[PDB]
Amino acid sequence: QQLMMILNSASDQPSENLISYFNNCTVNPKESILKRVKDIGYIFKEKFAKAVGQGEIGSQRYKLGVRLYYRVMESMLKSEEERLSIQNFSKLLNDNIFHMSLLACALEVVMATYSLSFPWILNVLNLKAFDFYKVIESFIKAEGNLTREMIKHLERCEHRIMESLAWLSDSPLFDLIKQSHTAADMYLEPVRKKSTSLSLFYKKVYRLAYLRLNTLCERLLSEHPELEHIIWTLFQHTLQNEYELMRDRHLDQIVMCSMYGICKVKNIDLKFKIIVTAYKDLPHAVQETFKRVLIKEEEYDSIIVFYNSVFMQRLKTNILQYASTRPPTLAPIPH
């Protein structure tokens, strides 16, 4: 609301102080940035009508999105001016996935405001969930006027990428796993060392998955406060070394298996029944997560079918280590 009148009263072309940044650049990005709005102007409007019948509206959504895009870019560039060398500043300003991700974020804000949302806009712009993820926090941090409900919504996009969308096949997340700080830092990362993107994503995933584990242990496993850290160590040893199981799957399916699992090898016998019912009570939870779980070659079954097939089949060598004389040393709980 307070933001939405900034946009309509403002103009659809870059500010005059934003354009300075374009011209302090060693390669002026402007015509490329500007061809970029126009080329996406076609594609967006096209796919817009392809889902909403017909009315003209597509263009107004976009032309607001664009004003937000420039307002946030201008605000983002002000901070990165001090952080980046002139070389990085100019590479940023010509990086396609950067600018695409920033605009995809602007557009999601307006579309959601006037509510076919997330991850709709990623399919429209042929933008990998994991690339787009990198712009979300510095975007929230770069628009003061985002409303609670809007901030809360971008955060839920972030949590859906961390929980599933970044774990689908052809997602660059797996390319980065095999090999082994702001949005610019992550877009400037070369595809060719450290990888700040993968690091921040994993640190964030762990805090997410761990808060979801922690509530679920306070309902069903309050009896043994000690079972939590064990279940967490299992999940964390799973995400780090058997990460291939999250492909085309959902973070919460691994949280659930790590819980029945540790109650299985300690003879606690609080079975999948209570787990799924209590999980329904997690915010935004969907029943499909446990009723519909992949095994292999597109064949889906229930969560108990997954536990006894791929999860147990991959982890028996490790899980029994927990109830033995020498159980593995504990993982740290995320800060």
UniProtKB/Swiss-Prot annotation:
Cell compartment(s), UniProt: Nucleus; Cytoplasm
Domain A: region residues: 1-180
Protein name as catalogued: Retinoblastoma-associated protein
Species name: Homo sapiens
PTMs per UniProt: Phosphorylated by CDK6 and CDK4, and subsequently by CDK2 at Ser-171 in G1, thereby releasing E2F1 which is then able to activate cell growth. Dephosphorylated at the late M phase. SV40 large T antigen, HPV E7 and adenovirus E1A bind to the underphosphorylated, active form of pRb. N-terminus is methylated by METTL11A/NTM1.
Chain positions covered by the region annotation Domain B: 194-322
Superkingdom classification of source: Eukaryota
Entry comment, domain topic: The Pocket domain binds to the threonine-phosphorylated domain C, thereby preventing interaction with heterodimeric E2F/DP transcription factor complexes.
Expression sites by tissue: Expressed in the retina. Expressed in foreskin keratinocytes (at protein level).
Residue positions, PTM Phosphoserine: S171, E189, A331
Family of this protein: Belongs to the retinoblastoma protein (RB) family.
Subunit structure: The hypophosphorylated form interacts with and sequesters the E2F1 transcription factor, thereby inhibiting E2F1 transcription. Interacts with heterodimeric E2F/DP transcription factor complexes containing TFDP1 and either E2F1, E2F3, E2F4 or E2F5, or TFDP2 and E2F4. Interacts (when hyperphosphorylated and hypophosphorylated) with PKP3; the interaction inhibits RB1 interaction with and repression of the transcription factor E2F1, potentially via sequestering RB1 to the cytoplasm. The unphosphorylated form interacts with EID1, ARID3B, KDM5A, SUV39H1, MJD2A/JHDM3A and THOC1.
General function of this protein: Tumor suppressor that is a key regulator of the G1/S transition of the cell cycle. The hypophosphorylated form binds transcription regulators of the E2F family, preventing transcription of E2F-responsive genes. Both physically blocks E2Fs transactivating domain and recruits chromatin-modifying enzymes that actively repress transcription. Cyclin and CDK-dependent phosphorylation of RB1 induces its dissociation from E2Fs, thereby activating transcription of E2F responsive genes and triggering entry into S phase.
Region feature (Pocket): 1-322
Disease: Childhood cancer retinoblastoma: Congenital malignant tumor that arises from the nuclear layers of the retina. It occurs in about 1:20'000 live births and represents about 2% of childhood malignancies. It is bilateral in about 30% of cases. Although most RB appear sporadically, about 20% are transmitted as an autosomal dominant trait with incomplete penetrance. The diagnosis is usually made before the age of 2 years when strabismus or a gray to yellow reflex from pupil ('cat eye') is investigated. Bladder cancer: A malignancy originating in tissues of the urinary bladder. It often presents with multiple tumors appearing at different times and at different sites in the bladder. Most bladder cancers are transitional cell carcinomas that begin in cells that normally make up the inner lining of the bladder. Other types of bladder cancer include squamous cell carcinoma (cancer that begins in thin, flat cells) and adenocarcinoma (cancer that begins in cells that make and release mucus and other fluids). Bladder cancer is a complex disorder with both genetic and environmental influences.
